[PDB]
């Protein structure tokens, strides 16, 4: 009875980062000690014309980003834990997340280590027009 | 290929929408197409949806700088024989809303102890995962009649777990600076170990120079077993599985061929003193 989430390829980190005190920080060092990222990702087929904005309510990707679903890429959605909000909701869940090309390889890991500007509504380094 | 750990156990026959579903393969086939997935105009997300996702199949076999393992050799564990806690887990099942997961139910030790909680599991809602009590039954069967007023009796888990760090701490706080779970097929030990259970690096005594076997959520803070008190999570725990030893059979008939004083009274209870029982006799006889 049920229906299967997730691939075995992802059994190791998710274990690993759903039994963790700091899951960012043990995400972090399984990439540091040679492990594969979270796959099995929704990546979206779009046209490639949108914003740019980081958090969006369809897909929105430009030429430079790839377009996922939200709780996708989501560490703690991925593994069923706490979310660090102080309400313990979701900023990503039932939204769109652009990621830029270069680091489409590892969604989960881009955002857990990069913030959206609050002005520009673009992620830091990778798209804000705030100096 | 698919695996079972976090298999939605919900009966809502459709997937989820993109934004929502965890993973692809939990997304909805009507959004599938040419690889991967579409957002289509005019089909909403789902507001008020409860999904029961199983913590059954989790895999313990990371290799990561600084994390110790938590399984550990036949050699290592006979080091570390006084740190030796048989555990036993008794379920019930999801019923009503879900079906398809076991979920703890009465938690046996080797000191004697069995707490009891409330059915709880991780139910994925569409802003969070809820922490929460689901519908259960005891499996049917007459080996399993003794759990039927277990179900009225349990305590919320952030009391179970407190209860389990003191048992812990109060029996091995002079005897190791660790605990050797001691087990027998292993995985639905493994997974009531996720509802009391953390892991990191090596870490020290919030209140003195001792090696941190427990976790606070109240403080984010670590105690070895005799600064405990409050704690409410055993960090970095090992453990080891008996069964993979060579044995063929249940473990009743194993633990029987060397000792006659544990009589079965079929409680988890009494499973985690065989079980310890039983690699003791195995491994120092
Ligand atoms: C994309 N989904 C699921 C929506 O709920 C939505 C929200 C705002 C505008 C809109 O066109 C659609
Ligand atoms: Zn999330
Ligand atoms: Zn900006
Ligand atoms: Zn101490
Ligand atoms: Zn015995």
Redesign the interface.
Known sequence: ????????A???????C?????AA??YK??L??G?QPIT???????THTGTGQAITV??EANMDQESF????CCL???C????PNPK???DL????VQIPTTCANDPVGFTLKNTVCTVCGMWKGYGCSCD | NVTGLFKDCSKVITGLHPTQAPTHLSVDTKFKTEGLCVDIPGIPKDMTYRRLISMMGFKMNYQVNGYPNMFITREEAIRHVRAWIGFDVEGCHATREAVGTNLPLQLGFSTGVNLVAVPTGYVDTPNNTDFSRVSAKPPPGDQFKHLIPLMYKGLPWNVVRIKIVQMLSDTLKNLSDRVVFVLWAHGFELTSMKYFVKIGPERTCCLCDRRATCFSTASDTYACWHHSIGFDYVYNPFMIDVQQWGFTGNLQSNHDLYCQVHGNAHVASCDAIMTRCLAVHECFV
């Open positions: 009875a049920g229906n299967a989430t997730e691939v075995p992802n059994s190791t980190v998710l274990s690993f759903a039994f963790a005190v700091d920080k043990a060092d399984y540091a000690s492990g099995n990702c929704v990546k979206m087929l779009c369809t897909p679903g939200g709780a996708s703690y959605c991925r069923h834990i706490d979310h313990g909701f979701c869940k039932g939204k769109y």
